[PDB]
Design an enzyme around this catalytic site. Structure first.
Site, PDB file in Angstrom:
ATOM      1  N   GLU A 357      29.423   1.193 -32.000  1.00  0.00           N
ATOM      2  CA  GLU A 357      28.222   1.508 -32.764  1.00  0.00           C
ATOM      3  C   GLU A 357      28.350   2.852 -33.471  1.00  0.00           C
ATOM      4  O   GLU A 357      27.940   2.990 -34.628  1.00  0.00           O
ATOM      5  CB  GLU A 357      26.998   1.489 -31.851  1.00  0.00           C
ATOM      6  CG  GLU A 357      26.638   0.112 -31.318  1.00  0.00           C
ATOM      7  CD  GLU A 357      26.557  -0.937 -32.410  1.00  0.00           C
ATOM      8  OE1 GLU A 357      25.930  -0.665 -33.455  1.00  0.00           O
ATOM      9  OE2 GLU A 357      27.121  -2.035 -32.223  1.00  0.00           O
ATOM     10  N   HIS A 487      27.480 -19.678 -36.931  1.00  0.00           N
ATOM     11  CA  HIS A 487      27.742 -19.544 -38.365  1.00  0.00           C
ATOM     12  C   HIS A 487      28.106 -20.881 -39.005  1.00  0.00           C
ATOM     13  O   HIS A 487      29.082 -20.990 -39.746  1.00  0.00           O
ATOM     14  CB  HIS A 487      28.840 -18.512 -38.595  1.00  0.00           C
ATOM     15  CG  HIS A 487      28.516 -17.154 -38.057  1.00  0.00           C
ATOM     16  ND1 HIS A 487      28.094 -16.116 -38.860  1.00  0.00           N
ATOM     17  CD2 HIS A 487      28.554 -16.661 -36.796  1.00  0.00           C
ATOM     18  CE1 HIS A 487      27.885 -15.044 -38.118  1.00  0.00           C
ATOM     19  NE2 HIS A 487      28.157 -15.347 -36.861  1.00  0.00           N
TER      20      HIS A 487
END
Lengths: 596, 98
Positions: A357, A487
């Site tokens: 992150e 996806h």
């Protein structure tokens, strides 16, 4: 009047309002994702509709410019980016039908519920539960039943929707001056600017398969080792000549083999390295974890993390009715606003997650000087690659010992190195064939080369050939196995993770080369290497302002997409498998199925 | 919520002379199409409003600036800094600057 000058003025006028509107929208999204409350939905309604009404009418104005005489490459590229007309090129009825089918597909896919036939009053979902039962179990009937139920009660009703969804998607792809939606997905991987670095959408069609056959022997040896482990763990259930069923990999899609690591551990006598006890004993809170991780970026050479960040960004303990999402994300709200959203805890997995992150956060700082429309990566495979390269580099035992977390008197050997290499390979290199076959399937189904009837047969017969996955139970034409994937009902390109891994390995090898490190490529350390940081920073700041072909010129030696470091990273693993699958034939046969 | 009371000029035909100010609100003409006091095909409003917020990052926040310029025209000068004084001493041969 002149075009280029008024184009620049219109671009600046657009960016002036785009900056603050995007800032407001991102701030509202951040606020709700930190403060989940009922009153923070109507404001996103009024913000998102305004953002849409700002992103289209300005793009509607991006049609009076004859983008053929502009001399500046940056201005031409930016105007071409704004020159996109979106999906509003069709009639209103067709557009609203497309929106309706997309919304209902999302809603139905988000309502996965399968009941165990003995008690039809208990339906499980994709969340832990059915997924947890399937992932962590030692049986054949239950996991196979879960697979069949998920791919039949979710993989059937979505098929009639997909039937005309594909043709509609290809239809406005044609209306968008593209022969097929596959080229629409390949438009990003294309540059038509400076000479000598030219790339085309059709080049990526043949640029995908030719870089995998070099990895095929390694995948074959890994599959042979997995088959031998299954033979010594699941007797009379896997064909030694053939391969394993779909559900026995560990996941229904065969994406990752992390759940199979315990069954296929190379050396299970020695436990893996875990320093969670170090945090527990030393009382390393979230702030300590973040600061000790930021020392890595400080040593690399990248700019120090901005002040006020600990104030605005939430880090830990949602606690009371004040709830926040536990999905670790890096928010670039604009106007110098960058924040992190994660539920920090005491876990080395959380350590690597925070590392990734903050890598995304540093990438966000990288393109700060870029204009509003150039604050994005050259290609989709750069953000995650940058995030994960350092995570791979910061997971070494040497890196752990460098911060004083570990004693200086360990006795590490080749056993733990091989164990870690195979544990990491079960997920990293074990997903490449699946990504390749899925991308080929999507490209050919959006290209129209195969008719309606040649969907299930072709998919299964290429999945058996490439990945080595057979049908645990037979299927018919009406089934849509790929439809039960994240996806596939979301219209998101999956080629990101294919080139992303090779970007990871190429950039890691380049950093190891220009980082004064020697030995195997899986033990490289880039900490305290200021010279290595500049190599990455030369391109991280550029973003989308330069071609990806030029992007693969300031970090890696060659602009070509060559899979050099994958065969060398798992080199100890390959030479250990050379002494493992001696008596087992490598490969699989496409003539045996679990049912017959 | 955003301090929009601050505006700055973004579009003008020419530059600024030293110590020159212009408050003209004429709509800029990026193209050649004349505009009758309203924006349009090639016309935009020359001033842009700031959206300053406390949440703004470093370099994007509002900043207060004052510039002092000193003029020394041949007219008698009266703007001068303070000049301190010592204490007087008596019955001692000293040099003084009254």
């Amino acid at each position: 009047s002149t075009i280029e000058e008024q184009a620049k003025t219109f671009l600046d006028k657009f960016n002036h309002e785009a900056e603050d509107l995007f800032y407001q929208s991102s701030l509202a999204s951040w606020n709700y994702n930190t403060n989940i409350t009922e009153e923070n939905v109507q404001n996103m309604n009024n913000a998102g509709d305004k953002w849409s009404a700002f992103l289209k009418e300005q793009s509607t104005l991006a049609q009076m410019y004859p983008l053929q005489e502009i001399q500046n490459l940056t201005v031409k590229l930016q105007l071409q980016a704004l020159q996109q007309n979106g999906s509003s090129v069709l009639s209103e009825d067709k557009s609203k039908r497309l929106n309706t089918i997309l919304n209902t597909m999302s809603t139905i896919y988000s309502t996965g519920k399968v009941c165990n036939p003995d008690n039809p009053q208990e339906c499980l979902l994709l969340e832990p539960g059915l997924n947890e039962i399937m992932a962590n179990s030692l049986d054949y009937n239950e996991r196979l039943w879960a697979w069949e139920s998920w791919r039949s009660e979710v993989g059937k009703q979505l098929r009639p929707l997909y039937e005309e969804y594909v043709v509609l998607k290809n239809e406005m792809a044609r209306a968008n001056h593209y022969e097929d939606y596959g080229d629409y997905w390949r438009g990003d991987y294309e540059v038509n600017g400076v000479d000598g670095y030219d790339y085309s959408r059709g080049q990526l069609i043949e640029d995908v398969e030719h870089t995998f056959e070099e990895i095929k022997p390694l995948y074959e040896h890994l599959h042979a080792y997995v088959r031998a482990k299954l033979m010594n763990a699941y007797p009379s259930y896997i064909s030694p000549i053939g391969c394993l069923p779909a559900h026995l990999l560990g996941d229904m899609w065969g994406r990752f083999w992390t759940n199979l690591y315990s069954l296929t551990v190379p050396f299970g006598q020695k436990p893996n390295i875990d320093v969670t006890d170090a945090m527990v004993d030393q009382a390393w809170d979230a702030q300590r974890i973040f600061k000790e991780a930021e020392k890595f970026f400080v040593s690399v050479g990248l700019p120090n993390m901005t002040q006020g960040f600990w104030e605005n960004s939430m880090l830990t303990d949602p606690g009371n009715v004040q709830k926040a999402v536990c999905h670790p994300t890096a928010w670039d709200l604009g106007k110098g606003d960058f924040r992190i959203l994660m539920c920090t805890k005491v876990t080395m997995d959380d350590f690597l997650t925070a590392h990734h992150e903050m890598g995304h956060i540093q990438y966000d700082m990288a393109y700060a000087a870029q204009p509003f429309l150039l604050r994005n990566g050259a290609n989709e495979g750069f953000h995650e690659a940058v995030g994960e390269i350092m995570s791979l580099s910061a997971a070494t035992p040497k890196h752990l010992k460098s911060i004083g977390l570990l004693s200086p008197d360990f006795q590490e050997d080749n056993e733990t190195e091989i164990n870690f290499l195979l544990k990491q390979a079960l997920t990293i290199v074990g997903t490449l064939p699946f990504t390749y076959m899925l991308e080929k399937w999507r490209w050919m189904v959006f290209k129209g080369e195969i008719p309606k009837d040649q969907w299930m047969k072709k998919w299964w017969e290429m999945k058996r050939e490439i990945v080595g996955v057979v049908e645990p139970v037979p299927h018919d034409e009406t089934y849509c196995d790929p439809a039960s994937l994240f996806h596939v009902s979301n219209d998101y390109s999956f080629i990101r993770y294919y080139t992303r891994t090779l970007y990871q390995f190429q950039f890691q090898e380049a950093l190891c080369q220009a980082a004064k490190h020697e030995g195997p490529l899986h033990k490289c350390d880039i900490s305290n290497s200021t010279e290595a940081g500049q190599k990455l920073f030369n391109m991280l700041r550029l973003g989308k302002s330069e071609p990806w072909t030029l992007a693969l010129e300031n970090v890696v030696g060659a602009k070509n997409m060559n899979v050099r470091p994958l065969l060398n990273y798992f080199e100890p693993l390959f030479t250990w498998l050379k002494d493992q699958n001696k008596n087992s034939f490598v490969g699989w046969s496409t003539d045996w199925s679990p049912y017959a | 919520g955003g301090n929009y009371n601050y505006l700055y000029r973004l579009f003008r035909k020419s530059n600024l002379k030293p110590f020159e100010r212009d408050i003209s609100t004429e709509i800029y003409q990026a193209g050649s199409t004349p505009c009758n006091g309203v924006k349009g095909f090639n016309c935009y409003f020359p001033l842009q409003s700031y959206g300053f917020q406390p949440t703004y990052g470093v370099g994007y926040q509002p900043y207060r600036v004052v510039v002092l310029s000193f003029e020394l025209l041949h007219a008698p000068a009266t703007v001068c800094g303070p000049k301190k004084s010592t204490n007087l001493v008596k019955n001692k041969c000293v040099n003084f600057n009254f």
